[PDB]
Amino acid sequence: HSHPALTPEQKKELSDIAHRIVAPGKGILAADESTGSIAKRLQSIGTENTEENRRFYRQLLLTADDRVNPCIGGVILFHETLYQKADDGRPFPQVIKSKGGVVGIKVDKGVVPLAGTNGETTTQGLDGLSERCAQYKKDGADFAKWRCVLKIGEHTPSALAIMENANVLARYASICQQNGIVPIVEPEILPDGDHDLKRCQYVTEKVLAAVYKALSDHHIYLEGTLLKPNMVTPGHACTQKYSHEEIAMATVTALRRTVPPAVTGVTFLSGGQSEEEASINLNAINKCPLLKPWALTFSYGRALQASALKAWGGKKENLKAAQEEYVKRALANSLACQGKYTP
Amino acid sequence: HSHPALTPEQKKELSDIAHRIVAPGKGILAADESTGSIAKRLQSIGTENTEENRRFYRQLLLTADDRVNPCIGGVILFHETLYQKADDGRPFPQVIKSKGGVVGIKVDKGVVPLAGTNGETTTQGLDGLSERCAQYKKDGADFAKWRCVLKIGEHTPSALAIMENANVLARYASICQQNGIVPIVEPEILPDGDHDLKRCQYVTEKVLAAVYKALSDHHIYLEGTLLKPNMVTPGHACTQKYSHEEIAMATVTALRRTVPPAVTGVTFLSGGQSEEEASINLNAINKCPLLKPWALTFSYGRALQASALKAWGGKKENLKAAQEEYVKRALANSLACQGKYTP
Amino acid sequence: HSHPALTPEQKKELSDIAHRIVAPGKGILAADESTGSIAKRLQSIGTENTEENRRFYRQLLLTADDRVNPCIGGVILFHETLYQKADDGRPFPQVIKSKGGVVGIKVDKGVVPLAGTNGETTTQGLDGLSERCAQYKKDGADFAKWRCVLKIGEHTPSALAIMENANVLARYASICQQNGIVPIVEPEILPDGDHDLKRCQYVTEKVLAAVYKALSDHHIYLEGTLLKPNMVTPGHACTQKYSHEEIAMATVTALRRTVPPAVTGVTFLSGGQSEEEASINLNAINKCPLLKPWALTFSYGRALQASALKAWGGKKENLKAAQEEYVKRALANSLACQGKYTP
Amino acid sequence: HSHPALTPEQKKELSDIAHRIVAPGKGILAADESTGSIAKRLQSIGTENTEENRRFYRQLLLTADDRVNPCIGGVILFHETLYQKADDGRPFPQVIKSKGGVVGIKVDKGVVPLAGTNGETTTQGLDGLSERCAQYKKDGADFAKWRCVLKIGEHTPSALAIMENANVLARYASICQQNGIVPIVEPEILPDGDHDLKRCQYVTEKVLAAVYKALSDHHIYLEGTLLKPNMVTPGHACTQKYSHEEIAMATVTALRRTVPPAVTGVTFLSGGQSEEEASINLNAINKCPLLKPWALTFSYGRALQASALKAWGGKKENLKAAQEEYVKRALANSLACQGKYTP
């Protein structure tokens, strides 16, 4: 029997949000970095990690020149950041919504080991997620992010890791759509190790097949979701070399064999790639001569903000300089998601 | 680990065949009717069922005017028919290949009850299927057909029926592609009963999701397959009425949520629909204002040959008349699969 | 490949605890009632719900006469209760361990709706469960309890409910055994509704089969677990009547077809049964003339403490009287789990 | 909903047969050797392979001294052998049933490669199996045998091999029980390769868990089945040495963690073990100090008939001598399945 998880109105608002985020030329900035990660990078830049340095840096990103308006379609925020105000006095959610962004938030609590496997983990944080999503929805967040991690290895990813992570993703997405928030499904496959494209493509296809079977079992409405996979690339330790067109063909091919066309958009990870290489690979993807029935765009945490971070140095007078670097990357990646970018 | 089921050459020949069959404007004639079914219909027309009446009728279909050449892309044959010759002396496989058709064959042995369920069946015939497919491949058959049946009911289709039929389909397709034959996956859902569109769409989505998960588990190469589903329609006993545009929207919607874009083409069943209604529904499908990343075309056993059969009457002098009727329908459905048909 | 989830020492301590709890003649008292439930029952008795009334009542149960020592093998506690002291000054964990009980605790956070189903729920609380189990392990708790709920209905339990609850149970048990705590798997099937034994037995077998497949997938060590199912009984609204021997035969039969013999013990729920009927059914179970390769015993929250509660009345001078009632039931159920009980 | 696969009468006849076969002290002789295998062994003995040599050899086995009556509970026959008569004139089915055996038959058609895996195979022969089982049932065969093969390897057995073979086994068993024939489920795991006990035990547990989940999904009646696994042993190429008590403990342990107690009996393979070693291992199994809730007995093709074969030499005057050897082994293994055997 069918007991519809969503009424037509709910479905309509979900699909509307999802189309706003990936609307042509637009992509997602990931500011979601937790105090641990942003602690690492603020230590890299040689500045102390304090609430004020974090807030100021995220002003540097969020307050950037209007030239980024037809670029950033959504901004993923960490919890704390939703409740911080810009020094002008506006809360960051209103700063973002004002210039046309959509607010996301990172709802997962991190990774937990799976016992009996080899270094494999699952993801955490389904408790109280519905009340949290209701609260974030009241606070202006229109989409959510959840990150599950899979590593290619000797005998890994195991069937248990794939099954379990797919199930948690689908359960997460169910809750989010019940509360009116577009889930972004992120089954990241770590580049670590030495493996050729063919194996990353094989594993990627298996993972995405399991993910969409799990989303079917949980009655997820696909027009109200986004997919956030990793580009198909060889491992860091792989000696063989691959042209960008081979990486593009492997990625698009892996997507066409799994992701059903109803999915609204596909927002790729940078995944430790070079800041410039990310936009080149994304461009090559959007130039692939196959039929891609969804929006292929970017969600870049590091690949957008690396140069801005290094150029800021933790000194406020560098502000303008820093932001300019950021703007550059944004524009570039915008061109990238349209296939019109050239270096 | 990956142990490729198919070498690049095998993949290339499979994708080439699959693109030939569904090439724009083209569809499939299903002549596959077994001696039992064709016995029923030859009794309906009031003629005795003999090898000669069958062979002659299939001449009536296969020898038809050249106006059907840019219409029929493939012809599904029953076993016996492959080994029958036209009275001109050419074997039917050469008659078909000569004017540009691709030869298929029906490889399943029929349905068997599943114990413990309510009237649910599975499909039979995986034994010796590889040797049979090698033989048919030598005899000119480039694609195969397998029919599995699912009925919507009170508590049916059960999880067991869906799982089992999906598994048998995937196993069938694996064998066929190993032998160089394009499998056509046919998970028919019977219209019998009274149920609104919404339930036929729900069930259809569940079935297709299970089918493509099973095809992923068995390492099937999707660019070398075709899908043959049934249009999403209310049951025969359903009192509520639906416009053709609603049926089209339900069908395309059910497909976009499941079938990945790599699948080459989708060839619909007529499924007991009226001879004219089939082409109207197919037209409305091809006019749907969504993005359909695959060829949507027809495989019609009855909806092509009904008028030709009735007009033939079992009298040889009626031959021309009969064939003309057939040609009409073919042309119509050709227009239908391009969206340009009007009644 | 195999990467053992547990070292031989860990396996040994788990199996030792599990054998202590179900050791012959012994069963479990469930004190785990949350402030909401115990709020209901303290309102039933006509006393205000306060931390002191709760603590005193649980003294009434835990401090009872030594005649219950070769009866209660374990005591399931709610969180708060672990940290409460008896007025003698001993913490309840030491009160229990002193007279030979094993301390359990209720680790689940309750039920959450599954969207898209009909009134079906899953269970919550896997977040931070490993740190919590480490803490409880330091505080003397040697086993954990998790309750998942399944209701028999028209088309329910659905495949999604069974799959999801089985997965959460297995994930829970994995974490608990990693921390050195014996999990008690409780897939309760609600008696609500009108259904004959045959359907409760069918559903019970399906659920337990899914549970043990899930425990196999998660690498659970079965000798270190306990099972806590519900007796197979007709629904409350079922008009047909069944002898206690039929209920016993249905229960033992459902267990022999699913639970593998490695499982240490089976501790039944009372499940809203009459206080006396629970021990009669349990007796009839232990008298069944089949081969039962595990300890069949009781975990009774209500069926032990009902008479004690009503006889206490919330008046301290009734203390002795109340405890005596409790002791009675304990002794009875002890006889019940040995098959030697008669009313 | 429940639609019982079997009526109580059917269930009763199935359980009765299954109890007759494994009745205490009794085991199964496997004569099922196909013309290919028996061709190999008749070539080993240096005799031509003809219908008459085969028939005579199977007289040598089936006509043996009455001392084997309280030993052999069932005899598995190949197809041809059912229709062969003893030179006394009695058909072999009546020869066997006369002295108290139960007739089985080998119903599988052999193994087929699974594409995309590494040397992994599935099993064949489900077509027309119901009519065949009806025929064999009319001819006196009361139980059936099906052999599926799994090899331990680097990354094998894969999830696909386990899933597929479990599904085929369950489908086979469903058909057999519908026709009134006790299926014997045989998921053989090949000893080939070098692997320690721990891995053979791990793999064995995974396989048996999948098998019984599949038998639950297909509504199999477990009291009407037998299990025929392989003893848990190191690979042939494994250098480490293991006492017979370690092999026994590993086998019984693997069984207690999977096989539910409802299963009637467990009949082990010899699996290329030495003729004497098989009975020693079986004895050690039946002496294991655990609780084994089912009959543990033998099904030995080679380990019974090796000495008889070699002693027969293909010379008719050796007949008596040959049979005596056979009788010896039978008696020994009878003692073995009671735990009372000593060498």
Describe the model:
It is classed as lyase. The entry lists the keywords glycolytic enzyme, lyase. The assembly is tetrameric. The entry is titled "Rabbit muscle aldolase using 200keV". 4 copies of one chain form a homotetramer. The first copy, chain A, has 343 residues and is α/β, with parallel strands linked by helices. Chain A has one domain (1-343): Aldolase class I (TIM Barrel, Alpha-Beta Barrel), CATH 3.20.20. Chain A is 45% helix and 16% strand. In chain A, the strands form 2 sheets. An 8-stranded parallel β-barrel of chain A has the order 1-2-3-6-7-8-9-10, surrounded by 8 helices. In chain A, strands 4-5 form a two-stranded antiparallel sheet. In chain A, strand 7, helix 8 (197-217) and strand 8 form a beta-alpha-beta unit. The first copy, chain A, is globular. The first copy, chain A, starts with 7 loop residues before the first helix and ends in a 5-residue tail after the last helix. Chains in contact: A-B, A-C, B-D, C-D. Chain A binds chain C through residues 1, 3-6, 109, 112, 114-118, 122, 124-128, 130, 154-155, 159-160, 163-164, 167, 171, 174-175, 177-178, 217-219, and chain C through 1, 3-6, 109, 112, 114-118, 122, 124-128, 130, 154-155, 159-160, 163-164, 167, 171, 174-175, 177-178, 217-219.
